[PDB]
């Protein structure tokens, strides 16, 4: 009754049922739900791509964060806030 707290120790993982897909037509990824499907950005699902299995959303953001070279701070705070709304859609769970 409240998935809506992923803190930095909270790993996330796709669960069983689900796999990413790249839209070349709208150059971007989207997460095929049993329902149907969601659009959303690579840097999105890069992460969840870029995971191999349960990292720590700061030590993605470390490699992502160099990637852009940006404050891995904002990089967390990004991603870690989008965790709360994929939950709500009964797609992501610790």
């Not at 870029?50 to 160099?66: E, K, Y």
């Amino acid at each position: 009754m409240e998935p809506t707290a992923f803190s930095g120790s909270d790993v996330p993982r796709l669960p069983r049922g689900v796999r990413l897909r790249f839209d070349e037509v709208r150059n971007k990824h989207v997460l095929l739900a049993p329902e149907r499907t969601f659009d959303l950005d690579d840097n999105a699902v890069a992460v969840l791509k870029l995971v191999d299995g349960r990292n720590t959303v700061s030590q993605i953001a470390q490699i992502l964060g160099q990637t852009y070279d940006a404050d891995p701070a904002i990089i967390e705070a990004d991603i870690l806030p989008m965790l709360a709304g994929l939950a709500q859609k009964r797609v992501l769970e610790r």
